[PDB]
């Protein structure tokens, strides 16, 4: 009867009184699995509802006038902006830490580290550290290939040496994904067609230094594919990671469904890919082998984050249900071995991530 994975419902934001109309991309944020921040318009009064995942039942509501609110991934520190005006408060200390008035409006922005906020304007991307007296630093100018796109994501590798800005647009009656991969070291940026992606550190056997992988999924005109490539120059003395490419399946019912999120577990070296309409896929980071695939949400998903505790992924859907899928450690090997009849991959993962099956 078994399953690779291990599904679980954490919450039903509606049972907390959140208007289903605020359970969406632009009003509900989940910069980590420690908080969920919803902006509601209770009366003629705008306010933010912070939900402490360790105390769901006690959401706290605060009057705000920001067009966007994003919570720090680890502390009750919140980024609030209104146009070109950007402020950052430490809710518990009820104080304004640091403040900055951009010269252009910020169309997207998301924490990328425990201390840095990324800001995307129509024509550039900035990083802004909370470490001391800092200010925003322009990282790179936006490529014309995303001009017009709706910015939906921004990701970085562990050493913030590679930056991914992802946008989407309605072209040819299908959502096409436009990505911009910038190389901090080489000051050059490459256009890519993609919907979702994530970076990952991986230590190839026979290599002393980890390798910086860049994985992205896309439903291009040639259908859906998933790529896993090493980005940048292999550390001196390392072998280069051989680029992988596989097909990501879409059933006939899923007509306009596409990749919407990706999280990678360095713990099991597995890629979690969730489609816009609730499909979840599990691939081997190393080989790119598809280990499992099946539906986990009937309502579309619009936001996820790594689920630290289980090393999986945890997102929210339009219904307000907080979902989370992770590797079912006790039974991921047998599954692969017996259900997928792939001894090799099974034997490899057992030994590689130190599992048992």
């Amino acid at each position: 009867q078994i399953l690779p994975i291990r599904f679980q419902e954490h919450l039903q934001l509606q049972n907390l009184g959140i208007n289903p109309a605020n359970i969406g991309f632009s009003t509900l944020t989940m910069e980590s699995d420690k908080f969920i921040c919803i902006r509601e318009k209770v009366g003629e009064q705008a306010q933010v509802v912070i939900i402490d995942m360790n105390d769901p039942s006690n959401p706290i509501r605060r009057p705000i006038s920001a067009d966007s609110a994003i919570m720090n991934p680890a502390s009750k520190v919140i980024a609030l902006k209104a146009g070109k005006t950007l402020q950052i408060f430490n809710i518990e200390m009820k104080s304004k830490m640091k403040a900055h008035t951009m010269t252009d409006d910020v169309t997207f922005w998301k924490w990328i580290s425990l201390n840095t906020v990324a800001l995307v304007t129509d024509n550039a991307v900035y990083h802004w550290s909370m470490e001391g007296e800092s200010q925003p630093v322009k990282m790179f100018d936006r490529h014309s290939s995303l001009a017009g796109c709706q910015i939906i994501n921004y990701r970085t590798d562990a050493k913030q040496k590679w930056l991914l800005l992802t946008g989407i647009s309605a072209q040819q009656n299908r959502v096409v994904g436009a990505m911009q991969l910038y190389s901090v070291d080489r000051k050059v940026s490459q256009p890519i067609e993609g919907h979702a992606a994530s970076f990952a550190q991986f230590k190839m056997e026979g290599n002393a230094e980890e390798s910086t992988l860049f994985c992205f999924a896309v439903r291009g005109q040639a259908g859906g594919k998933l790529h896993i490539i090493e980005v940048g120059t292999p550390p001196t003395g390392n072998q280069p990671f051989p680029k992988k490419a596989v097909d990501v399946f879409f059933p006939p019912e899923a007509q306009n469904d596409f990749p919407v999120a990706m999280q990678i577990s360095e713990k099991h070296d597995v890629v979690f890919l969730i489609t816009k309409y609730g499909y979840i896929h599990l691939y081997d980071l190393e080989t790119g082998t598809c280990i499992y695939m099946n539906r986990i949400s009937g309502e579309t998903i619009f936001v996820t984050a790594p689920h630290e505790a289980t090393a999986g992924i945890i997102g929210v859907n339009r219904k307000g249900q907080v979902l989370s899928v992770c590797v079912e450690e006790e039974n991921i090997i047998p599954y692969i071995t017996n259900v997928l009849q792939n001894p090799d991959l099974a034997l490899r993962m057992a030994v590689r991530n130190n599992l048992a099956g």
């Binding site: 605060r62 009057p63 705000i64 920001a66 609030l80 005006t85 402020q87 809710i91 009820k94 304004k96």
Partner: peptide
């Protein structure tokens, strides 16, 4: 100048 979130 001003504050974008009124604290308790």
């Amino acid at each position: 100048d001003t504050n974008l979130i009124e604290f308790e």
